[PDB]
């Protein structure tokens, strides 16, 4: 149940965010966290080590994504000069 | 109740008890120059809340991924007797690509 | 090897307890629900995930 | 007549209280909210590390010690690096003035309820339990499955490098591309 | 059991926290008296007999000294960072075995617990420095972040080489495994590297960049006064001792010797403390011997010297283990 | 100044040891592993060093039919 | 010469570790029934300790009696939890 | 009940109901953990066939072993009571001397080697039973017959000697 | 679960139920007869029952309400205290055990 | 000495033109059973890559600096050697997979193995690895040279799980044991 | 076809070799018999095709 609540925070914090792209990239990190939590909680209920193994591989690719994101964000900032997302 | 749970409580009450004493038994006389930023005695531009070049941020990106890599090697360290040779090979193939 | 010798006399006592409580629950259901409803299509014994408890713990 | 069922409080050897999972659960949602509603990007990222800590403490209390510690170990270094990028790439003062309106509240309510209603059925009985006749999980002991009990970090190690080594090899390629790509796009040109 | 669970837990925590907080106070006097001897001085000898009440006067003086909350500072964070650093530094003493399993928590994964608690406490330094909104504290906090990007992989790499020999991740089992040989003999390069990283991990000299007084005025703690400063000092000196204990746990046999339970339990406690006190001396000796390194050079030293060597050991060491048939059983034994 | 490996490998290995020791000796130590894996096991078994049998981690179920045991029956309980 | 005043704070640091090692061992030797405690415990040992309480009432009490006390077939504990299956 | 290890167990549930008269009664073993570890290698040396028969029956009825192999379980309990009685009537002092050391030593066998070497020679000459551990490396002397134990906190005394059956002093 | 690898290094508790469903499908379904797999339906429900527990949750709810309403209505004579329950099957507490078992 | 059971493990059946000898052959068998054509093709394939980069240089130069092309040859040289060895291994193992004409391989398989039977030695040999570890190795490498274009993999484990009923080898050797005894009788 | 044939029939050999309760694993002798039959049938089919080519020579 905290799995849905966390997943909805990260989805709206990605789509309803009007501040900056690091907060965009943070909200992806929240969604993946909630999904990993759902997988970790199910795996304990079903006596499965595969779910914890699946969780660990979503942590490793979630860090790979956030490094590729921060690298792309720097490239964009060097040229644009603001990573602020502009409304009106 | 368990030693760990009380250990957490006591360290926090100590962090509170030390803090509470100073919040109560010390003089508190705040004024404009006492509450200014320290800049070796001269007031300067306030520019610590504006973007600042970090010349070592490429370290921070690579630090992010090599942490994931050494964490993925810790289950092998605690499973060597079962991994044995066949499991060792994969661990070496993984560390060679990294 | 010291544990392997103890395993069968320990697992033999545990099985007697498991069969003693399963048979007891099967009786306790035929006397309260009228019959014994089936959670499993198979005849295999499954270690209970849920147990019926009394509404209060011992007074102490 | 016949007692036949004894409920006894466990003196020692008893577990934690499940009240604490409700404390960690609410704090984890509170902290998640503050990550996105806060006007300052550093309190926003402070709440971010607090969110992972509550999720990790929850994971330790349910007995997933390695993944909870591994989550806290990896996401503290990650949050520290995220802090480092906010300092370099965000004007803190102008962003604390980056006020937002609630024209998106009505979308929030509709989008919130519709997804939550839809995904509540997708989640299974194992999890939706404990959302005046409650159920009680019953546990006993075996000896054949206890001859050499491993720790979950060892149980994963028993198979992470043989049975599922393809995932490790693919994982390694994703890390390699990130190590090469993240540097190709941000390297000083000289 | 014989008496209450809560009382047993109560007195065990006291026996761990109280003697450690006393031990922290004496490391501060001992460092001041040890460098002075190396400096042809005396060190504290007038606040209490032979100067043995100096740390308490310093502690008491600060808890009666006025706190200042700067107007430019984010104040909730200005107080949160030192509180985080202190609590999370002192938590690391909850898994130290003062004997076989004689720990507040004999956890099966106490090495990962120590990595999590140390990493979380450094985040307080980062936050407190940034929160001050003063230039030198801002420059101090950025160095502390550079420093953790330098030593964290180094320690985690180093410890993984100890876990390959022990096979456990439990602090008592690693100590029990060293009844065969202390890990400073087969893992001699790892011991030097882990010790180097521990000095960098503690922000001790020659790696005192975050709080350097000759480059920044006090670095991250420059706006911090009274109790906030004292929280950061107890965290630092408590971190020194804890890292010396952990170095003794992992390379020097821990508590291994170099009414009846009380006499035996004492020998374990002395033996751990003697080896810890020697390594505490090596820290103070190190601050007194060397200049401060430059922060660019510390990052390059860890990343082009230390880690490349540690990755090659991570390959070499299991290859020696499989070759000699010496992979440790990973079951519970010692 | 600096030698090239493919032009003069030995002069490069000397230069690499003296001038870039941490990097060069990382490659030696790391390469020493696969050399260990290829040479120690054959010589160990050569000198009679025998790899030990795996320790039991599950009850060893005997193979073959059951042994038709007589003894310790219900009558013997009293 | 030897600056022995310099070595006194190291003697105090060592003694505090000695106090902690002496204290922990005595209070757990007391807690376990004038008996040395247990360390590195797995599911087997935790179960065996509960099977000692079933025969002696103390988790760390020992009986070589080859016959079980009557009612031992009934005191086998089944653990009850509200949430974490 | 489930084999999952509990994390939030604040209560225990019992069942006063006895096994039905149709199932023969067996007095359960009354020995505790330390005595059972000191007698395990003698239980094994006498009840291997019965222990091996129980487990092969359970592997012959998957999912039904608890209910269809009850006679074998009664047989193992009876077989393992015989050794306990035999050790009691012939090795009572030595047996207590060993499992008491084991209780003070974390149930670690290497920590009580002089008490085992006395109890084993009493068991060998009285109950004619002998501790055997399979697949021990042949080159090296067996670990339970090594004079020096490297993981023992108190060094094995020079006077105390290991017990090998069929060899005199 | 379906993998065969559980949390303690031993096998997953729902693995026997997964192997029976796979065994049933492979040994009943074929190209000649598309409908052999209908034999796999009870085997499939059992694998889900060992995974989610909805049917065993439903049985315990029924019996637990039936049980409590009976013991509540039932005549009460003397409650065995927790100390008496703690003294079941001890060495020198025969009186307490007899009271607990009502024998 | 008949095992009385020759298909211990469930194996994947594939529709192929030729007889299946071994779905997971040991690396030494793939090399040993390689035909001289396999050496010829693999050597030509290894030559093909740097010879390709040479022709591209001759017809259309890269205008690279003074020492860049020699560097590129070393990479092209390796990649062709690596690609041509995978080609040579794949050609021999397909004759083991039953996915290439393998009449020669079948008879030299029936001889080698039935020799191992009468010698009493294990058909596929002995393994340091545990019986379960052998299974993981068999299930990682059987039919694994079909993926060589993406991920290479070679069997270095002596395991007994090769996908073929072993009865034909036993059923054969005893006939060579029947004739050997009879031939010795008339002497 | 609605019949699914396993790409990986070797999943029938999965499962931890450690801490196995007695009687935990089901007896899958019939599955092995089915897979043996498929291997024998395919190989028999194959041997009856390369011999027809010998006849048609
Ligand atoms: C631990 C021991 C605790 C008790 C020590 C006190 C005692 O019992 O004194 C007895 C006795 C009393 O002599 P004293 O009162 O020093 O006066 C003697 C002369 O007057 C001294 O007159 P002097 O100054 O003309 O004598 C020269 C002497 C000065 O030093 C000494 O007097 C002691 C000799 C030290 C040798 C190296 C020890 C390490 O030698 C040196 O110059 C020292 C060697 C220089 C190189 C050091 C590195 C090796 O001294 C000894 O025999 C003790 C020897 C040294 C023990 C170690 C003390 C320091 C331990 C450092 C620990 C660091 C980690 C914490
Ligand atoms: C870079 C330089 C690489 C150097 C490689 C290590 C040095 C060679 C060590 C050696 O001489 O072993 C010979 C030794 C010969 O044994 P033998 O007594 O003469 O005959 C018995 C039979 O071999 C059958 O014996 P068995 O059935 O009783 O036992 C099976 C076998 C069990 O051993 C195995 O199963 C290992 C084979 C792994 C599967 C093949 C993987 C190849 C695919 C590569 C994937 C690339 C991804 C892109 O046990 C062993 O023989 C122990 C071998 C030594 C420990 C295993 C470690 C060797 C692998 C090292 C991997 C290096 C990774 C470098 C990073 C590469 C990526 C950047 O075992 C091997 O043949 C190992 C071959 C490893 C080749 C795979 C690596 C390519
Ligand atoms: C111990 C007990 C402490 C509490 C005693 C009650 C307080 C009585 C005095 C109140 C007035 C103080 C005052 O005006 O001081 C001005 C100043 C500050 O007063 P202030 O009014 O400027 O403070 C401003 C801050 N607020 C608004 C929160 C009050 O106090 C001091 O400088 C010191 C105060 C006393 C502290 C003495 C040392 C503390 C540590 C004691 C260790 C244990 C001792 C044990 C033995 C004691 C003797 C037997
Ligand atoms: C906590 C104690 C842990 C035990 C390990 C350290 C023992 C030594 C520390 C206590 C020092 C004793 C006090 C002292 O120095 O006497 C001189 C002091 C004199 O004050 P002084 O600090 O000015 O000393 C003057 C001498 N010179 C200048 C040369 C240093 O005597 C007293 O003050 C009377 C005792 C009152 C304090 C009693 C409580 C002390 C703490 C508890 C013990
Ligand atoms: O979390 C507790 C855990 C100890 O591990 P374990 O002993 O397995 O858990 C027992 C839980 N009753 O401990 C851990 O592993 C996690 C570290 C302790 C939990 C956080 C401690 C600080 C909490 C207050 C922070 C205030 C800011």
From TrEMBL, chain E:
Protein name (database record): NADH-ubiquinone oxidoreductase chain 1
Statement: the UniProt record of this protein carries the keyword Metal-binding: no
Source superkingdom: Eukaryota
Family named by the database record: Belongs to the complex I subunit 1 family.
GO cellular component annotations of the record: mitochondrial inner membrane
Compartment annotation: Membrane; Mitochondrion inner membrane
Organism: Chaetomium thermophilum (strain DSM 1495 / CBS 144.50 / IMI 039719) (Thermochaetoides thermophila)
HAMAP family according to UniProt: NDH1_NuoH (MF_01350)
From TrEMBL, chain H:
Keyword Transport part of the UniProt annotation: yes
Classification via InterPro entries: CHCH, NDUFA8
GO CC terms: mitochondrial inner membrane
Lineage: Eukaryota, Fungi, Dikarya, Ascomycota, Pezizomycotina
Every CHCH domain range: 91-124
GO BP, one annotated term: mitochondrial electron transport, NADH to ubiquinone
Main location: mitochondrion
Keywords: Disulfide bond, Electron transport, Membrane, Mitochondrion, Mitochondrion inner membrane, Repeat, Respiratory chain, Transport
Role played: Accessory subunit of the mitochondrial membrane respiratory chain NADH dehydrogenase (Complex I), that is believed not to be involved in catalysis. Complex I functions in the transfer of electrons from NADH to the respiratory chain. The immediate electron acceptor for the enzyme is believed to be ubiquinone.
Gene3D superfamilies hit by this protein: 1.10.287.2900
Family: Belongs to the complex I NDUFA8 subunit family.
Organism (species): Chaetomium thermophilum (strain DSM 1495 / CBS 144.50 / IMI 039719)
Any one Pfam family match given in the protein's UniProt record, by short name: CHCH
Disulfide bonds: 47-79, 57-69, 101-112
Protein name: NADH-ubiquinone oxidoreductase
Keyword Transport appears in the UniProt entry: yes
Cellular localisation: Mitochondrion inner membrane
UniProtKB/TrEMBL annotation, chain I:
Signal sequence coordinates: none
Subunit structure as annotated in this protein's UniProt entry: Mammalian complex I is composed of 45 different subunits. This is a component of the iron-sulfur (IP) fragment of the enzyme.
Disulfide bridge partners, by residue number: 14-50, 24-40
Name of the molecule in the record: NADH dehydrogenase [ubiquinone] iron-sulfur protein 5
Organism per entry: Chaetomium thermophilum (strain DSM 1495 / CBS 144.50 / IMI 039719) (Thermochaetoides thermophila)
Subcellular compartments: Mitochondrion inner membrane; Mitochondrion intermembrane space
Lineage: Eukaryota, Fungi, Dikarya, Ascomycota, Pezizomycotina
Function: Accessory subunit of the mitochondrial membrane respiratory chain NADH dehydrogenase (Complex I), that is believed not to be involved in catalysis. Complex I functions in the transfer of electrons from NADH to the respiratory chain. The immediate electron acceptor for the enzyme is believed to be ubiquinone.
Family note: Belongs to the complex I NDUFS5 subunit family.
From TrEMBL, chain K:
Superkingdom assignment: Eukaryota
Name by which UniProt lists this protein: NADH-ubiquinone oxidoreductase-like protein
First and last residues shown, out of full length: 87 to 143 of 147
